[PDB]
Every structure is written in C-alpha cells, then in structure tokens.
Structure 1
Amino acid sequence: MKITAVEPFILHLPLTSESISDSTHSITHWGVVGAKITTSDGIEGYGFTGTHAHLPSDRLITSCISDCYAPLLLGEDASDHSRLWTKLARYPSLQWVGRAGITHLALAAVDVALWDIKAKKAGVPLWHYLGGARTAGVEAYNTDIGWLSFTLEDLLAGSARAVEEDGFTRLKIKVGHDDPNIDIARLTAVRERVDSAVRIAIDGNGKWDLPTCQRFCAAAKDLDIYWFEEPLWYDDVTSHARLARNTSIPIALGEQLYTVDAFRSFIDAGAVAYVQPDVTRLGGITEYIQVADLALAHRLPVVPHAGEMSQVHVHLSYWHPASTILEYIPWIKDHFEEPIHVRDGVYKRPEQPGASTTPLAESFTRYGKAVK
C-alpha cells in the first residue's frame, strides 16, 4: 500500500544502572532513533537504529530520514521493500556521502519499518512471516551482568545471580583493561564462582592490538572462553585473520560492520567464526538476511548483536537456520508493545503482528527527544 507519512523519532531510554562502561564507551541512556512509516490503510511500521544517545548525532540520523529519504518514500508502495532499499541506498547523491555511517543507519531504520508493515499487514509476527521456526527454543546469553565498569565484587554477584537465580547458562563478560592480566584475574574469579557448565564469552569492543590479543588468548587457555568478540580494531581484517590462526579461542565480530562487503571480507579471510550482523548497523533486515545467508554458506553460526536489544533479532534468530544463541540486555524491552521475554534462559516466540519494534505511547511521551 502507499506510503502516506514518514515521521522520525528519538527515544533516550535509561539503563539498568546510572552509567555502564565497556573498554571504549561510558553511557547513561540508550538511543532508539528511527522512523514511523504510515501507509494508506492506516498501518504504522516502526524501525530504528541503536545509538549511545548523543542528541546532536541522533538528529543527523533523523534529519537524513526526514529530509533525504522521506521524499523518496512518500507515495511509493511499501510492499516493495527490496526495490525501495536500492532506491534509497544507491540514490546517487546520497551514496556519494554514504555506503556507511549516518546514511546507512538511517536506511536501517527505514528498512526495518517497511518489514514491520509487511508482517503487520500479513497479521503475523515476522519470524512466522519469513517461513517458521528453526528451533524449539532460542537460548539467551546475558551481557548485562558483565560490564567493565563493574567492580570484581559486583561482576561476581551479578554473574552468580544470573546463573543461580535467573536460570541463565550463558554469559558474556567485557574485557579491555589496559593490562589484560586484570581481565584474566576477573575471568578467573568468575570461573571459580560459577558452575563449570556455564558458558562464558568475552568482548573487547576493539580495544587491543594484535600482539596484546595473542598474549591474552594464550593466557586465557584454561578459562574455557566461548568466543572473544571484537578483539581488534573494527576495520582491520588482517589482524583478526592472524589472531584467529594463532589461538583456539573463536573470534566473534560484526556489530560495527555496515555492509555485506565488509562481512564478506572478514568471512573470506577466516577472520571471524561467530558472525554478528545487526539490523541497526547493516541496512536493516534486508541486508541482515544477505549476511545471514553468507554465514550459512560458510556454515558459520549467526549470533546477532543487540543494537536493537533483540527486539528484531528474536524474530530473525527464531527463523534463520544459521542462527544459534541470542544476546540479552533488558534495558529497553518494557518500553515496547511486545517486550522480548526470557525465562529459564530461553526467549519466548513473538506473538503479535510485526517485528516487535512498536514502542508504547507512554514511552514516547516520557522519553522522546526533539528532532530539531
């Protein structure tokens, strides 16, 4: 049906703690920056990217949606999401300043909105729309207990609680101290504290260089590390490729990669084992699927990064057959008409029509930010 409006929005949503840090960033709010797209039948779709809620750059994203993309969308058939992807992504003067960064992030929001419309119009949740479930249950792993800002006491207590009270069997812990031996001490303590059956991944958020990583990986050989995420600089294929061959610890990455080209480059190089596409980083669901299919072709597991806090990815992980486990961070879920829900370490299947990207009205009222 015809697109009748495109309306950008910004939400700045509070976190589990007043501030959290990884190796590289410290944040107080999560940005949900996106667009609401309405069709002539009254259907409203929502899509968004995920930011660190820095309002001046959030507004670059919304301005690209309103001023650059909206005129290319109004009056077009929303059904035609694959045609409209190319229309926007490769619009020549936008491509000139694009292919990555702001324009791509804004493209992601639009694309996801169109998919939310499609599934809404069909009257079914997206995972079902796309062709049904590949698993009886998508397992969660808990990232929220693992922030680098946590003192060791708090890291241990939260990790213990997740496992002993909340039924997680999979955690992810941040690393990235200037001296990695501090990380080794932290992980060693977590491993002594929790049951040996608990799987523990780690994430460096691109902090370290190749030689630092080689040493750390050798030092972590007995800690049964499930994967090491973003060990190195995001755009350095070759360093990842060298590291992967130097250790048995699997490398995970993808949350900072904007394009299918970039994923191809890392995958072909053997520089990534756990592939982490993100509909908020890549060009939406349309490009995510292409990356997932690339991963499948290499028989590599798809573990998407929670740029959208798994609101969209719970669908894609329930559906796409290369998928395995699913990141869990509970910061924003209660602000959606259909919150993700994890119990006993398993994500529930979405039930409402769409991609569970529709925020509560009250959340816009309370936490909406002006776009100009």
Structure 2
Amino acid sequence: VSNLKITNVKTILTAPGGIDLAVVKIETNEPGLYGLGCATFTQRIFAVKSAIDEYMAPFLVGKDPTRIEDIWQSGVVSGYWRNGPIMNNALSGVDMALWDIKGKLAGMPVYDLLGGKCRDGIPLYCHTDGGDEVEVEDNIRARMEEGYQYVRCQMGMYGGAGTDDLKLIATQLARAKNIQPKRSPRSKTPGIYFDPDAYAKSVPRLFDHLRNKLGFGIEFIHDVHERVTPVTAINLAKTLEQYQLFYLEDPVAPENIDWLKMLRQQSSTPISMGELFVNVNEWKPLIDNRLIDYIRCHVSTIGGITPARKLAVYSELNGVRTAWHGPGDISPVGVCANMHLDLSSPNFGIQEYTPMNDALRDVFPGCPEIDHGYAYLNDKPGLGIDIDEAKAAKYPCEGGIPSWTMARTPDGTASRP
C-alpha cells in the first residue's frame, strides 16, 4: 500500500447513550481503509465540529496518514495558539483515527503497535450513588454481585447536590437527603445550590458506614470534584486515611494545583487529579513532584493517543499510574482508545467505566466485552471499533447548554463545579 493519502475528514455527531458525542472519520485513497477517533467535549460539540470541519479537514487532505507524530506536532501548532479543550479534541479525533488506520495497515490492534499486552484483562470501577448512606450501600452490593471489585461512592453525586440535568450522565441523581446546608440569603440568584462544608463533613460519615457494612476487600473511590477549599480538601484527605480509599479524586481545581504541595506533606490517602487538564504545565509539576498517584486525563481533551502515550510514560518513570477519564461523555471509540493505552502501559492503575446501553453497542460495533468487573478488548486491527453512520443518525445530538455547571454556594457565589 504505497502513495497513501487522506481524502476526507468528517465529524459525526450522535447521542445513542443520551449524551452528545463527537466522532471523527478519516477516509483514505485505499478503498475500504478508514479510521475513527473520539473528539467528545460534550458541552461544546458544535464548536469542536467547527474546529474539525473548517480547520482540520483542509490541513489534512492529501497527506500521508502514516506520519502520525508529524501530523500531530504540526497540527498542534497550526493555529499558533493551542493547549485548549476545543483545539485538543479536534486533534484527538484525527490522531486516534490515524492510529486506527495504522493498526489496520499492520493487521494489529493498537495495543500491539504500542508494545503488546501487559495484563490479561482491564480492571474497572463503576459509579455508585444515592440520597443516603443505605442507598449507596445497596448500589455497591448490586455492583459487587456483577463482579465489580472497585467502585466510586458518592452520596448526592458532587458536593451533595445530586443532578437534575440529563446532559451530565443522562440520568437524574438525588441530592443528599440528610445533609443540612446553611441558610441562603433572602433572595437567590439562579443556580444549583450546594454546601461545600456540609458536603465535606458528610464524606467521612459515608465511608465509616460503608466500611462497617461492606468491609475492606472492596476498593473505594471518592470524587471531590473541586467542590471545597484546598485546606478543606487536605483535612478531608487526612480524615479519610483510615478508610483506605483506592484514591481520592480532584481535591483541588487545576487553578489550585500548588495546594497539593501542602496536601502531600500531610496526607497519605492516594490522590488522583486531571480530568480537567489541557496543558503540560498543569500535569508536569504534579508528576515531577509526586503530588499525585494517578493521572486522570480525558484522552481526547489532551489531544489523543499520541500525547496520552507520552503522559503515560512520564508518569511511569515517576511511579505514577494511569486512570484515564471514563465518564458517559466519551464515545465508544474513546473508551477503546483508553483501553488500548491501558493494556499496553506497565503503569496502568484503573479504568473508570460507564456501562453502555444496547443503542451504543449497535451504533458502535466492537465495544469491549465486559465480564465480571474486567474489560476484554477484541483483537481486531486498529482500535477494533467501527461506527454505523445510518444507525448513528437515529440518535441526533440535543445540543444546547448544561445547567449543572452553574454551581452556587449558600451565599450565591458562582463556584467551580
């Protein structure tokens, strides 16, 4: 296969799981040979589509798709300004599709191009929630019955607020029932109100209950989701040491990463950070200084497999493990990309997993097999995943803007959500 060229780049917007996704398909001049990539930044899908269709398409047409790194390095600087979530997702859609094409050319899964299997299956964690400790407990028992050996445990999702916004995970979750928030001022500006201090106090109570009822064999994760002041998060990490979490996630905002210096002087609770990261200057000081135990980047939002590989290696050499973002707002193509990285990384930590519905499996043939808390990738070439464009059209994106991201503390302050 010589004189290989990119012929077309297109964006497919689809929501079979009830959450807006963006997927890139790159066609070549070799009949039947194409690649797929994930560009899912769900809150800005139309702007990602614009970045792909108006900019990436004329940048790529006619170029040899074999040169993944050169295309990545030149694409990243093509607009001069860079290091942002919309830009990165456009590059990710392209980059993953190129890895997909290379694996097809090689007759090899991407995990094989990257050095082959380092494990026999991919251990997963899934989410459990509830309005009180008993409901959280009940949900964890149901997941344990299914074979999950790791679970994230929240009571009232993030900051105890729950969610009524279907744009987040396509399902409503109850506010924490028994958290007594502070009284607000006499008129309130609209928002999703939460009480960071009432939330913080509830977390150790939740884990005390769960450990009493469920024991210490089951692995537990909790996500702070940047909801409290940094000293509150530090105190939280210290009080949770006794409950031996697999990790405590996002104790600080990316804008407050310096505070992890203080956190790591005091606490030995394992820490994860980074689903929000878009810049090397966010993650590099954390990893260089061993201020986290797991890196959490959303692969498409850091620009695809090419940069994720590099992050996985940088973390490896510093004893930091991977925990790629696995929410509902990631396409099955991105779930595959996370998993090809997972299977080939010596320093894989865990794979967050949001279970799919039948519509997702139908629109995307080749979804990883989930069997008793482990994921098993098929051994098909490239990413081992495909998209049925006609079936995708049955689930048009809803578009619009989320409501959950307007988070206000009791006095009405707009807060990092």
**TM-score, normalising length: structure 2:** 0.78
Q: Residue 394 of structure 2 aligns to which amino acid in structure 1?
A: R
Q: Residue 299 of structure 1 aligns to which amino acid in structure 2?
A: G
The offset of 1:330, in angstroms, is: 0.8
| 2:54 paired residue among 40, 44, 67 | 67
Q: Residue 25 of structure 2 aligns to which amino acid in structure 1?
A: K
Pairwise CA RMSD of aligned residues? 2.2
| 1:255 paired residue among 250, 260, 275 | 275
Moved more, 348-357 or 279-288: 348-357
Structural mapping, 1:160-175, within 5 Å: 160-163=141-144, 165-174=145-154
Question: What per-residue deviation string (whole Å, max 9, x for no partner) do you get for residues 173-204 of structure 1?
Answer: 23533221222222223223324200101111
Alignment-derived partner of residue 19 in structure 1: none
Distance in 1 between residues matched to 2:11 and 2:203, nearest whole Å:
41
The offset of 1:207, in angstroms, is: 1.3
Alignment-derived partner of residue 33 in structure 1: 22
Paired residues of 1:209 and 1:233 also in contact (CA < 8 A):
no
Structural mapping, 1:347-358, within 5 Å: 347-358=375-386
Paired residues of 2:15 and 2:395 also in contact (CA < 8 A):
yes
Alignment-derived partner of residue 112 in structure 2: 128
| 1:9 paired residue among 4, 7, 12 | 12
Secondary structure at the counterpart of residue 347 of structure 1: strand
Paired residues of 2:20 and 2:398 also in contact (CA < 8 A):
no
Q: Residue 312 of structure 1 aligns to which amino acid in structure 2?
A: A
Secondary structure at the counterpart of residue 15 of structure 2: strand
Moved more, 281-290 or 343-352: 343-352
Distance in 1 between residues matched to 2:64 and 2:340, nearest whole Å:
24
**Is 1:110 aligned to 2:94, yes or no?**
yes
Structural mapping, 1:279-294, within 5 Å: 279-294=299-314
Alignment-derived partner of residue 371 in structure 2: 343
The offset of 1:362, in angstroms, is: 5.1
Secondary structure at the counterpart of residue 322 of structure 2: coil
**TM-score, normalising length: structure 1:** 0.87
Change (3 A) 1:156 1:318: same
Q: How many residues align?
A: 348
Distance in 1 between residues matched to 2:340 and 2:211, nearest whole Å:
32
Structure 2: state its 5+ residue gaps.
Answer: 161-195, 400-417
Q: Residue 364 of structure 1 aligns to which amino acid in structure 2?
A: A
Structural mapping, 1:13-92, within 5 Å: 13-14=16-17, 29-41=18-30, 42-52=32-42, 54=43, 57-91=44-78
Paired residues of 1:208 and 1:233 also in contact (CA < 8 A):
no
Distance in 2 between residues matched to 1:263 and 1:75, nearest whole Å:
35
Distance in 2 between residues matched to 1:170 and 1:370, nearest whole Å:
32
Change (3 A) 1:59 1:232: same
The offset of 1:150, in angstroms, is: 4.7
Distance in 2 between residues matched to 1:291 and 1:119, nearest whole Å:
21
Distance in 1 between residues matched to 2:385 and 2:92, nearest whole Å:
13
Max Rg structure = 2
Change (3 A) 1:291 1:2: same
The offset of 1:58, in angstroms, is: 0.8
Q: Residue 170 of structure 1 aligns to which amino acid in structure 2?
A: Y
Alignment-derived partner of residue 158 in structure 1: 139
Question: What stretches of structure 1 move > 3 A for 4+ residues in a row?
Answer: 149-154, 360-363, 368-371
Structure 1: state its 5+ residue gaps.
Answer: 15-28
Alignment-derived partner of residue 18 in structure 1: none
Distance in 2 between residues matched to 1:31 and 1:193, nearest whole Å:
37
Paired residues of 2:110 and 2:340 also in contact (CA < 8 A):
yes
Structural mapping, 1:256-335, within 5 Å: 256-306=276-326, 308=330, 310-331=335-356, 334=361, 335=363
The offset of 1:357, in angstroms, is: 4.5
Change (3 A) 1:362 1:167: farther
Structural mapping, 1:153-232, within 5 Å: 153-163=134-144, 165-174=145-154, 176-177=159-160, 178=196, 179=198, 180-232=200-252
Q: Residue 328 of structure 1 aligns to which amino acid in structure 2?
A: Y
Alignment-derived partner of residue 243 in structure 1: 263
Paired residues of 1:336 and 1:356 also in contact (CA < 8 A):
no
The offset of 1:281, in angstroms, is: 1.5
Q: Residue 5 of structure 1 aligns to which amino acid in structure 2?
A: N
Alignment-derived partner of residue 192 in structure 2: none
The offset of 1:39, in angstroms, is: 0.7
Q: Percent identity?
A: 22
